[PDB]
Design a protein around this ligand. Sequence first.
Ligand SMILES: [Zn+2]
Ligand SMILES: [Zn+2]
Lengths: 54, 32, 1040, 53, 53, 53, 53
Amino acid sequence: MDITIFNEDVFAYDMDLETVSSLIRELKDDDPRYWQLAKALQRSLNIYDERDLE
Amino acid sequence: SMFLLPNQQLERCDRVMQQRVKPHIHTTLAAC
Amino acid sequence: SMFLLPNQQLERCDRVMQQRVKPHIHTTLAACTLRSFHNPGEPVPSSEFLAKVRNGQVPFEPFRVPGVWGTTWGTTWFEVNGHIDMAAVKGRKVELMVDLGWLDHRGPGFQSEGLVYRADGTAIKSANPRNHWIPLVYADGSSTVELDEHGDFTVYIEAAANPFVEGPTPFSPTELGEEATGTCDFPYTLSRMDITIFNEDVFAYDMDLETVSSLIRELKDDDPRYWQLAKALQRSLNIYDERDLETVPAARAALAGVLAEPAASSAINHIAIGHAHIDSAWLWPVRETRRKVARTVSNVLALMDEDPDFTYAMSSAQQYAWLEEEHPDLFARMKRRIEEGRFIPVGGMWVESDNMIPSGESLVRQITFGRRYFKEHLGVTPRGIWLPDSFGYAGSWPQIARRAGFDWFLTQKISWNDTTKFPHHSFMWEGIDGTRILTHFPPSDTYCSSMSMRELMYSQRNFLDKDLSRNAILLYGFGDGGGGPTREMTARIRRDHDLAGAPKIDFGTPDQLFDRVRKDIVDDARGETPVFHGELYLELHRGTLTAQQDMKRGCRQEESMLRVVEYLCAVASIKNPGYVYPREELDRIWKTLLLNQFHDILPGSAIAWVHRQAREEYARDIAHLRDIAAAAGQAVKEAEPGIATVKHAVIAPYASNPQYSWAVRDGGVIPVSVERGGNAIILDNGRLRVRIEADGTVSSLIDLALRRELVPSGVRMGRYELLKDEPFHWDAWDIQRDAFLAADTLTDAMVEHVEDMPDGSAAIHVVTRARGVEIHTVITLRPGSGSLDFTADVNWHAVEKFLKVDMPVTVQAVNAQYECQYGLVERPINKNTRSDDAKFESCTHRFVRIADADYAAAVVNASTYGSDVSPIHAAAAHGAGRGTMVRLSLLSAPLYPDPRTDQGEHFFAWSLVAGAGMESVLAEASRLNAPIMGELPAVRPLATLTDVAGTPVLDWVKLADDGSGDLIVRLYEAAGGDAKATLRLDDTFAGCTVEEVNLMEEPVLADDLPRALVAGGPVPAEGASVSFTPFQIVTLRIRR
Amino acid sequence: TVPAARAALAGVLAEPAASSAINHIAIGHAHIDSAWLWPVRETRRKVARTVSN
Amino acid sequence: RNFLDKDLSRNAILLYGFGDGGGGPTREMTARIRRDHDLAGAPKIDFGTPDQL
Amino acid sequence: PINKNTRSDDAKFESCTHRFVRIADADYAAAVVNASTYGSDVSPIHAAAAHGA
Amino acid sequence: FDRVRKDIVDDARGETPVFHGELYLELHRGTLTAQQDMKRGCRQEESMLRVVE
Ligand SMILES: [Zn+2]
Ligand SMILES: [Zn+2]
């Protein structure tokens, strides 16, 4: 139980990742949206680094 | 160039939320 | 009348087991008194502590029925006093129902455990998370414990509190497996512990309900068996009542009407084997695996005491030796049970080690040590290899296994692939040469199975070879580091003998199953025998080859140390009499080097304890071996005075000159010239012209002897790359395809002063810096040679990174040549299909060769075991940017098993050879991977090969392990072409006889083996001719 | 070559079925319609053909 | 597969023979019935009468 | 490939040849030079013999 | 094809699919040795054209 400051960009990025990942799971394997979302998620995940939040 | 495995990317992303991106939403500064 | 809903009956039955029938199996009758004595330190052997208690020197404090007792990596002794009374439990079993307070969703074998020792000192059983009953009084009068005058007894539980290494989130960094801190971190809470009586009919009814319910779930909705089973379950569930237990017989009979129908005569005849894989050191130290194996043996013996028609298996004779040394009674009981034929010791290897990384000499040492131990301690000879958990299998294994006497092979980890599925589950694995060995896979794809019916039919469904085999193996028993078979699975096996709708399964032995497979797929197909040629390559992990580089470096160093010291000891023994062979200390260095080569130690995945004890043992062994070599050398000099003296005493198995192979040449015309022109440094040694760029990179390595340029003009040699790897499953073991995409090319370096060595060599120093990494790299161009040497000192301090160095060469081909233990292997460079992509990281041994019709280029390694080869087609003109790139993996930074991995200074060395002939590559690799000694006397080579026709090579020279003084030589071929040679000894080995023997060193040979001699009888050892088939292995014994 | 081939195929044609199947009973039946697409003078011919067959 | 009462009956009827106005049993089906007396993987079928069923 | 390992490798059991087929190892090679045929097949042989003959 | 070049060459920047070797059809395979006279004559006239040219 401690005083904390809130980060907005990190929360927005987390929510976007959650939305994309949840949309990928339920789609079929015969839809270009599935592959496009998977490729976008792979591209995005290779840039985010927790050692520097910029 | 390597092939794409969406079922592996899903698990990687799930781990990313579980361990990496969730703790970085609130930054502590003191105690009460 | 109402309709039937099977999906509702299933949930009703599930609730019935969860709430109603489970608690009515054990009926409590009294309570026992507990006292505790704690120890937060290194455990005392149980033999001494029980004797001390018997005499009486240790106090005991009262312990309440509830409460906490645990301590991080600590031990405790619970003295337990009961008050069981006879004359009222006649004919009924009595148990203990010990509950240390295990967690639910953690795992069966990764928590606090403990044996229940008798007052005298013997062991009764162990308290496991899934097996927590101790047999006190059997139904038929017999009592394991000794009862006193007025009905009371006492036992001693040796509780060990092992904290769970894994943290809150999966694969999280935890500072638990570092030391034995005496603080409350994960304290266990004790639970109910009382004397209970066992009910048999209730347990049988529960097991029948479980079998029926599990069979209903997996069946389809279009099978009358499904509806019949659902109706039978509904009928049976309406009769059983928990308010009065006399209704059980009236309900079992109703349910048994559909439990006696024979199955269809087309199912797979499974054979069930009890197996419990105790890992020697993964998450616990080497001092805890002894306790774990003792618990496993005690549990297996206790279960087998009451239940006939049971089988079990146990490999890793290391554990057999530990059990014999520390538990005479357990070993005696195990040996007594072996005579009956229900405790089959399977697996002739000394310990379940890795395959890809260890050298072939280590493999043969394990095989011979384990076979000798089994032969002369247990009087049983194994027939096959038993390796149910390993990462990748070398192609040389079939040949060694067949020449060692084994005749079948069993593995299961290949099914853990990521992209492709193995074509067969029972086939003939063909070695690199010609050697075919029968291989079988467990269809269930698990060595630790709970014998669930779902798994039972999954094994049948996943069987690819369903058309000509009709036979499969199934290993059952909570394992993966602790456990062993329980009553539940041994009841399921008996219930499922010939149950309709499920595959038929019975007890048996591995030999019977393998004979059945041989009859089915060899002697009956008559031309339809499945065959798999090449090597078994696991498609998972792949990051283990370059994790904890210190372990692999030390292992290579001590392997070379053993080779040199054994040669020196053999020379000392054969030169002058009175020199006792250091057999004892040699076998002490062995069985410890070989122990440290475990499948969860050598690749590196464990807590800091294992990776620290391994380092300390490596250093101690190296020092002791150097001392032994110095003593043997001093002994040799006493045979006759004033022979010679050699500085640095470099000994190499192979050399460019055939007569200089096992020479004693020391370790230390055209001096190298440097032409500092422009923004580059140009060297000239008369055969190579290397142009080092501004910042520690090579842009040209022109071969002046052939006017050939082998550096593509799209990239620069020697560049260091820092790939970011963040694995999500099996962090230390595995590296994913995430790397090789987010590559980071280091571009912060500057050359240093170029130095001309006093001997004549030329060296260029350079420093490279990164976020938390610094590298001091020296490039050496030795005069009068054709190899460019690279040495590096790294100060790794980063987290979650991966260091690589690339050595591109313009030679273009399709397949790259790595080397296996005793041969070579071809692997594709340009990955075409899906399955070809998964082989993006493979193990390498001391060199990688890329060859075309005439020209070949090699990258000879010193201490790294991983690399990757990829084609390069960059942007250039006139086709100047086409070639191949071989990136050597230096080291990674795993975080889960060890919070700090590879911190400090690391030393790397390698070289590049142009015009790479096989003999030249072998000679230079031998030069690089050779120990540097001090001052030992110079002696002539013991055995030489003068009429070489091909590429023969001396691999090992030693003495006879039987004490006869016989000389032993081990030879192999390392190119692929046939070889013919003549062996010559020196002086004292005149009028001798040389005979071909197997790898076991005994003089018995098979028939299908090619053989190397001319007749087979004793041939004089002067001008003896040896013939080689592609990648042959030959062992020769020479008398006095 | 027919006898040498029937025996090889008959090895998997004599295994008893699982003791859970439905015991079907087969009845020969030819439904003859009195008058659908033909006059009442043709159903006599049709039933005669059926009985003769 | 289409039998709803599969839990308490274990009995079914099957009429064979070309019908819908013309036909009657031929040699092919009366051979199939004999071949499928107790064939594994298929339901058991035998000759009989409606009264017995 | 000569020894077909996987499913896809088996399908390449007959391939076109032009005027020769060469099987080579480190040093020694043997060739079957053709004149007018455009098809062949290569398969390993491990027969029943002694001393690996 | 310009669209494909833009999509998979100038945009992937290192993710371009590549297939090395030869495209081998896994069907037919009997055409290589059918009507041998045609292939024999074709080889003969190819040599004839070479020499005559
Ligand atoms: Zn293991
Ligand atoms: Zn009608």
